[PDB]
A paper describes a structure:
In the nucleus of the infected cell, influenza polymerase (FluPol) uses the viral genomic RNA (vRNA) as template to perform synthesis of either capped and polyadenylated viral mRNA (transcription), or unmodified anti-genomic copies (complementary or cRNA), which then serve as the template for vRNA synthesis (replication). ANP32 is required for both vRNA to cRNA and cRNA to vRNA replication. ANP32 comprises a folded, N-terminal leucine-rich repeat (LRR) domain followed by a Glu-, Asp-rich intrinsically disordered region known as the low complexity acidic region (LCAR). First, it stabilises the formation of the replication complex, an asymmetric FluPol dimer comprising a replicase, which is part of a parental RNP and synthesises the genome copy and an encapsidase, a newly synthesised apo-FluPol, which binds the 5’ end of the nascent RNA replicate to nucleate formation of a progeny RNP.
A minority of particles are apo-FluPolB trimers, whose overall structure was determined at 3.57 Å resolution. These particles comprise the FluB replication complex, which is similar to that of FluA, with an additional third polymerase forming a FluPolB symmetrical dimer interface with the replicase. Further refinement focussed on the replicase or hANP32A-encapsidase moieties improved the map quality and estimated resolution to 3.3 Å, enabling relatively complete models to be built. The overall architecture of the FluB replication complex is similar to that of FluA, with most domains in the equivalent location, albeit with a few significant differences. In the FluPolB replicase there is a rotation of ~15° of the PA-ENDO(R) towards the PB2-627(R) domain when compared to the FluA replication complex, allowing the FluPolB PA-ENDO(R) 63–73 insertion to contact the PB2-627(R) domain in the region of W575, a contact not observed in FluPolA replicase. Interestingly, there is unambiguous density for the FluPolB encapsidase PB1-C/PB2-N helical bundle swung away from its normal position. This structural element, together with residues 194-198 at the tip of the PB1(E) β-ribbon, makes a significant new interface with the top of the PB2-CBD(R) (residues 466-474), which considerably reinforces the replicase-encapsidase interface. No equivalent interaction is observed in the FluA replication complex. This extra contact largely accounts for the fact that the total buried surface between the replicase and encapsidase in the FluB replication complex is ~ 5100 Å2, considerably more than the ~3300 Å2 for FluA. Human ANP32A binds in the same position and orientation to the FluPolB encapsidase as in its FluPolA counterpart, but due to sequence divergence the interactions are not necessarily conserved.
Residue numbers in the entry:
A (entry chain Y): 353 to 375
B (entry chain B): 1 to 31, 34 to 189, 201 to 643, 652 to 670, 684 to 752
C (entry chain C): 1 to 200
D (entry chain A): 195 to 716
E (entry chain X): 359 to 387
Amino acid sequence: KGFMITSKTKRLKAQIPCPDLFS
Amino acid sequence: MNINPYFLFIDVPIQAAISTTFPYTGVPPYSTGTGYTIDTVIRTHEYSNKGKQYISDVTGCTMVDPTNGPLPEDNEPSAYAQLDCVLEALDRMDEEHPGLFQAASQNAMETLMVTTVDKLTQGRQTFDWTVCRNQPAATALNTTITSFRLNDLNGADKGGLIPFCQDIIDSLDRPEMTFFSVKNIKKIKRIPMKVKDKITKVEYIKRALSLNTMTKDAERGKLKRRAIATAGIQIRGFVLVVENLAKNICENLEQSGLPVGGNEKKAKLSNAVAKMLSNCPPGGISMTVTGDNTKWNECLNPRIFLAMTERITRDSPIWFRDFCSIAPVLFSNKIARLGKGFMITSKTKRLKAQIPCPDLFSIPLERYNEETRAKLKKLKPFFNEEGTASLSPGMMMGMFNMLSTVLGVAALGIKNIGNKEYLWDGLQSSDDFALFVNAKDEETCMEGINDFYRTCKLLGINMSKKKSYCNETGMFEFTSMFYRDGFVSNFAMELPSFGVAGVNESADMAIGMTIIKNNMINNGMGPATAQTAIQLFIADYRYTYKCHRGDSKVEGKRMKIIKELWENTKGRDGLLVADGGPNIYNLRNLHIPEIVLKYNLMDPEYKGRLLHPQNPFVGHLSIEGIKEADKKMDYDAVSGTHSWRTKRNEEQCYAKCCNLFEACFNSASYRKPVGQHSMLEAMAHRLRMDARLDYESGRMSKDDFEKAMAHLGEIGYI
Amino acid sequence: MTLAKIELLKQLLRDNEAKTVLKQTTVDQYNIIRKFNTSRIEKNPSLRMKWAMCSNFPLALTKGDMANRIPLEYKGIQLKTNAEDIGTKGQMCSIAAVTWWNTYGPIGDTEGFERVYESFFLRKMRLDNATWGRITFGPVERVRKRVLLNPLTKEMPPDEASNVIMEILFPKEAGIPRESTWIHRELIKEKREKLKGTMI
Amino acid sequence: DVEKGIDFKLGQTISRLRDISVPAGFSNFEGMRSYIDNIDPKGAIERNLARMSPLVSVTPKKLTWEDLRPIGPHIYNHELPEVPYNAFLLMSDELGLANMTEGKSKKPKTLAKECLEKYSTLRDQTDPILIMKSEKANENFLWKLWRDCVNTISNEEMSNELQKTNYAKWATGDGLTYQKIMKEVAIDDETMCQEEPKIPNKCRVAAWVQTEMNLLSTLTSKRALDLPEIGPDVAPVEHVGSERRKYFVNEINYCKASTVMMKYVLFHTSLLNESNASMGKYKVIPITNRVVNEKGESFDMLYGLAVKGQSHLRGDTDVVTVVTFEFSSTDPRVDSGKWPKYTVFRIGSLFVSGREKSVYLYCRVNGTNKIQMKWGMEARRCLLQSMQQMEAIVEQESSIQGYDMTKACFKGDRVNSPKTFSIGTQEGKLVKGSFGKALRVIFTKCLMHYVFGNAQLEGFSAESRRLLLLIQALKDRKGPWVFDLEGMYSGIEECISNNPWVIQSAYWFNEWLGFEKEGSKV
Amino acid sequence: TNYAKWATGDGLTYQKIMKEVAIDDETMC
């Protein structure tokens, strides 16, 4: 599924898919 | 080289170029008002905190009484007005005028006995207690009338304002109070219904005495915001009567700038300055104080106004004296509503919530900002449990303009203190006063100015030592009108009036041209300026209604039809600017409606089509505004296709009853009907006569007649 | 229409509120009844008018047979709609139909304007035949005076003016002529004759 | 019944309220009524004054030139930051993508499409060169949003709405908003505090304001301000008016401030139209203008693009967000203090006549409301404010000598020299200026009074008018006296915080006051 | 139910966004 990145100040999350692991 | 616009004043006097100083072309300041309202309450109580503090046993709200209080020992604003000094000023005014008080009071009483309740429908938005909001005056009055019907209160049907005020005063004693409240029931949809609600006597008294608040956003030339207060319908009658009485008194007073407006005020200003210049002794100096009063309503106790009302009506019927003294009583025990409350937010969770005023003190004060912390720590003593502030002392802006002006004129007219070798007189109007002091030297001029300042401080009036100055007579400013060496420049501030009036094409055009011509007459707008104003207004008018010249290649829905009409009709000088016609208006003919102006130049087909006797775009009910353009400005227009109206943005009961009555008696829409009988029977008789006449003329069939008469008999009138 | 009037009256009376108000308020009190409108006046007429002119059908047309003269869409341009209305109970329309009416449609009568708008045409006549002269650029001394803005055919107080207007254009509802119609009998007959033959 | 009279008696609650609403020292309204009806004051005012403390008085002090001091000394201080450019659109930096057109008026979307079509290099530029990302905005968001703008403008479909509708939501920051909860949770929660008020920054005198004031007040070969015709002039008075009007427009039309004013008016008109027509969809709006050269060629100028957010607002004071991308020929690195609010690129270069000059795109997020949105289309009244005063000026001259001078004041004649005002300065030497230049200066002053207008400007002008009138009185030797000078000065100077026009007005006021002080010796 | 949403912390949940914005935002880690 890739990875998950998150901004705590904005309280936002998003999933980076495997094909986009270097973008 | 570095440009500098201020250098224009090196080669020109400031008054001549005063118009450019004012930034009356940008966006006026606009806005929660709860903070401002709380600050106003805080300041009002602070100025009078040394008065007598007691607790009202009719409502339970704290009251502060500054009248006859300690004499101020500092320049700070003081509401401690001495009653004896007020009565002395009133007595001096009475002596200086022949029975003016009696004449004014009698005329006020006479016009009051003739006034109807519906006069209360005029004005601006008013506080409605049935919903505890701000509603249009007409709707608020209608709702209060409806509510009164439930609690055995009547007099609105009786007509005149006397019964309405009488049963309003009665309502304050009913052990309960029933009315209809809006219930936004969930069904998901939120549907509003009427729910029969009841409140006790104390709650009703508080609601009647409450003063709703709003932010004065429309202001143009003030950085700091002020709060304007709207009162309920239960004070409108009394406030109206007292204001009319004060207007009657102040109109005769040559020292009063109100209610005269326009060139009349300039005439008064110039006449007064000329008078004072004439009256100066030989070699003496007549100094003019340009004054701009501040805290003009946060220092005026309503008790002083009660005393003024009683003294003004010294010789009048007891019933009228009692009636006209109710407004000062209601204002002396008023309560102030408090905006919508502060808003608290946490940024670590992106959360926010507005806190309603009743919950102001449900939160630890350590969470509000330090400024609001202090505000609430100071407002706690007068805070009502329901979420209102007890504000007895002082007045909110805009209520007693005439009465406050009369008090100011009373202060002005003393004209001397201790028989000192000077005199003073001036102009006063609703928080703006210009004073003139004549003496034999500057030192005595300022002795007189200081004496007048002290005397003002004895009535709650506190002239602003920061917004005022003094100079030699012949140069000053009054209510934003500048006088210098006989030249009174009407400060050009009517610029924000050249936009389309937004009522319809022909009416908007007539209003704009009349505005241009009136500005030319009054403000000295030069002919070139008027021509350019015509140009700009025509540009805006064409743009706003999507009707440019038919020849021009602009594209649009109506523009294609305008293009078609351009060549489908030969006479091209008769079309209207709303039909892409060429502009014809100039300075010489701003007073003529264009339809009559272009009547000769039109074509027979064009004038027949446009000026059709019947137009689906013209309706009878649309004629209401044909007289006055909302200030009620008179404009001259012509019936035609361009006289249309825009779409709209016990209600139906009254509305359709009145509409049907108008449709039956077409004369009603113009002049007040007369008759001592029920509307139903008048309509029934008129309709019976009309049906008979229609049949006898052959306009109605026999079956139609029989059906109509059957319906009328069912109505019970045949 | 009188049958429509009686049917509307019956339908209105079917509700008890209409029955109680009509039988309660005398004819004189009608004024008060009329003044109980919403008073939800537009806060900014300029913005409202600007927005409305861009809407599909801002014009509020009164229900009638006029609409049939014009299609609901002419030359691929929408003019009027058959959707019902609540504010005015009529139909909706657009300035396109107004411009078309100014272009084509029924041709009315031109007689009425010769006399009905007599004051305006007299203003134009006084302007056209006026003679201009020089311009004096020197300072002008002006006095503030109470002046009549517009000429009047026969100046009269407001009440007499209203009574005369009713006696002119409202033949019915003329009970007991006062001591004002005999004074203005010539004006009454002149205006009556002039305005006869109109449909405004 | 005529022997009875009206009956209006007070109930119980109202009577009690009247009883307790009597001034101090009374115990019943009957007592107050009797006291007022009977007691006679015969010098109560003097008795009260004879005891009131002598520490209360107007404090009358005569005002001399020395007392007047420069207003707002903090602008001089260099420790404070330079004032930034907070106006809605660029004024002296706008780059006009100009396309010659036969004269046909077309929809703004098609006009922008064609203007970009002419300049293929800038239309197809896709690799930006970030010159500066200001403080918070994201370069990726702004560049992608601008690319979507260009694609939408250049798309074949007439629709002018963003085709993404989701990237813009975060580019404009619409989603970065708090979520409102009910009062109960806020009461219970302890971390839900109240935001401290955000006061404006205390800045210093910039330099771009003066340069823009100079540049917007100069003639340009390009004219845009056009006005509708009026009817034939038959009276002599309207003939004189027409001559004056022509002499004025021949001067104002060619000043760049007129072009800026027309650009602002057109942009705000288009913004209002889009907002009313489109409520809850992101829109693309070219910043269009029309410019006629002396030869009569009606160029159409594209000055940039703007994304309009979601304007679904019932009220008027509600804010709607718009992001502006503006073509310009100015590299901000020359003066980075003027552009701390702008994230810019370098999207190429262009030749005007053979002299290559760069072309950058200034991107910035901003917000407006229906009130300012309307006033944008009412900004044309500046023109009127420019004419009225000058009209008065001319009329004054006409009062002196009989004939009409509008040709004499502007250009002069064989009997009277051309009228010259004092307009500027250099090296401490004040310089004169033609009548037309003075009219231009006044028009630009009015335009700036609009563009940089807010609460601070009103509070500054309406309160410095006091000092203006005091100086006017002093120049006429009226010997004006003042009560609390420091109060007026504090009132005025509590408005010079961050408005560029307010700071420059304070600076010019101080300089002119110094000039008046030095010239008062005579 | 409305109160329990914030009492239990269920309402304090981060918001999902499209991968394009997240990649284009440099503050998301």
